[PDB]
Design a protein around this ligand. Structure first.
Ligand code: HEM
Ligand SMILES: CC(C)CCC[C@@H](C)[C@H]1CC[C@H]2[C@@H]3CC=C4C[C@@H](OS(=O)(=O)O)CC[C@]4(C)[C@H]3CC[C@]12C
Length: 433
């Protein structure tokens, strides 16, 4: 686990460490003051030379110049301003029905298997859940993965994210069947962009027949592409949203369930809170979410130890002194919430999963914790995701208990994002016996 090697190095060699595992020499920077300086100013922008790995994968255009991978400030800001409209408080409030719907479908599907005996991959079920939410919420589409459909589509995502991590030259070293990987990954990326054309087409047709579709992310990514010569920019945003809008939430759900399977005390307390704030309501209202304070803590603590988005890069344009170390200009700086969250200098007993760290009255972590990143390039979807995941967790806590199958490991793996090494295979029982 490469991130653990970074952690080791940050601990042993200081807040600024030169690394060589990527195609360009980079430096990992782990003091909270440098985080503040570089992430909190629009003077510092993403390094396009690192972001090319998302832009294009094995030669095949993927994220392109969409909202995540465009690094130029002006070009980024023009699109960010348009797309922000799909994330207003009212927009998000109007997604509650979709969150509630898909979370309820997941729960019923799990309860149907809850005989303490049938193994279910919670990683897969949570990815199906997150994908059906995103497709419906952002694009008006029903993927129905919870109901067994669109398997090829989640496959294609897995292949291409594997591809991104595999592209690392120091890792993309010397094995034989790198040829098959290339074709499968290229083919997956083309598949996904074609899905995109189909879905955009659907929307365009609806509009031509005079339907009034409520404005969603799709509306705004179309709006951001008005004067375009072709649809490539549009499809870059489709891919951006499709992936960024479900993969990280699915990873974060899967980590949280995996970790809770060994935290019976925390679980009991989550269950009490659920019963208390939502009782036996079937659906959550938006006001309910704010009261799931303890669940909120658990989710936060889950992101400290297990941040799916584990790093971000900024271009250091000119030679500069950083925590005492001279860093050459034109150097990619890596900031890692994964690393900092596991340093005992920033967190006491860092490997202990302790939700009280985010308890009320506790001081907020100060530039040592950023699972949605910070500053102008922080996650546009943070509130959407925090809503989404509390809805899913609250529903599960209300109705089900999980036992991890013996032999399942607690480890992580990097496939672009971090996610559980194992599929979080569980057996399930209805809550209470
Ligand atoms: C728990 C889930 C999520 C986590 C941990 C997460 C994390 C973050 C982080 C750390 C970045 C990267 C910034 C970089 O390259 O350094 C990112 C940006 C972004 N995320 Fe999220 N994200 C999540 C959910 C979502 C959701 C639900 C959506 C969309 C509905 C979304 C959309 C995006 C987009 C479009 C960007 C690029 C924003 C910009 O640069 O203006 N994310 N996110
Ligand atoms: C887009 C959404 C899902 C958020 C993604 C957030 C993380 C997971 C992204 C942001 C920055 C991304 C990388 C950029 C650049 C690289 C270099 C590349 O190796 S290299 O040989 O091409 O230098 C390996 C993948 C890696 C580390 C990335 C993994 C994935 C990465 C950390």
């Amino acid at each position: 686990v490469l991130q653990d090697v970074f952690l080791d190095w940050a601990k042993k060699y200081g807040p600024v460490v030169r690394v060589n595992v990527f195609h360009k020499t980079s430096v990992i920077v782990t003091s909270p003051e440098s985080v503040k300086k570089f992430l909190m100013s629009t003077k510092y922008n993403k390094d396009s030379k690192m972001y090319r790995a998302l832009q294009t994968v094995f030669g095949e255009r993927l994220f392109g110049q969409g909202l995540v991978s465009e690094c130029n400030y002006e070009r980024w800001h023009k699109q960010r301003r348009v797309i922000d409209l799909a994330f207003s408080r009212s927009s998000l409030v109007s997604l509650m029905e979709t969150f509630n719907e898909k979370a309820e479908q997941l729960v019923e599907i799990l309860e149907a298997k809850a005989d303490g005996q049938t193994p279910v991959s919670m990683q897969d079920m949570l990815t199906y859940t997150a994908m059906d939410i995103l497709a419906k919420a952002a694009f008006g589409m029903e993927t129905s993965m919870l109901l067994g459909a669109q398997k090829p589509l989640s496959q294609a995502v897995k292949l291409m994210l594997e591809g991104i991590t595999a592209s690392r030259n120091t890792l993309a070293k010397f094995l034989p069947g790198k040829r098959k990987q290339l074709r499968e990954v290229r083919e997956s990326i083309r598949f996904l962009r074609q899905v995109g054309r189909d879905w955009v087409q659907r929307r365009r047709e609806a509009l031509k027949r005079g339907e009034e579709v409520p404005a969603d992310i799709l509306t705004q990514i179309l709006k951001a592409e008005e004067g375009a010569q072709d649809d490539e920019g549009l499809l870059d945003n489709f891919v951006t949203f499709f992936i960024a809008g479900h993969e990280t939430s699915a990873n974060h759900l899967a980590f949280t369930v995996m970790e809770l399977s060994r935290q019976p005390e925390i679980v009991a307390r989550l269950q009490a809170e659920v019963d208390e704030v939502i009782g036996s309501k079937r659906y959550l209202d938006f006001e309910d979410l704010g009261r799931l304070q303890y669940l909120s803590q658990v989710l936060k603590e889950s992101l400290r130890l297990y941040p799916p988005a584990w790093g971000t890069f900024r271009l250091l344009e000119e030679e500069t002194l950083i925590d005492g170390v001279r860093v050459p200009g034109n150097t990619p700086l890596l900031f890692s919430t994964y690393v900092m969250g596991r340093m005992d200098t920033y967190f006491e007993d860092p490997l202990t999963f302790n939700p009280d760290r985010f308890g009320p009255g506790a001081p907020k972590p100060r530039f040592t914790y950023f699972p949605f990143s910070l500053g102008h390039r922080s996650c546009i979807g943070q509130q959407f995701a925090q809503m989404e995941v509390k809805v899913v967790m609250a529903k599960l806590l209300q109705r089900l208990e999980f036992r991890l199958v013996p032999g399942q490991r607690f480890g992580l793996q990097e496939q672009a994002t971090l996610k559980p090494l194992d599929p979080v295979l569980c057996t399930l029982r209805p809550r209470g016996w």
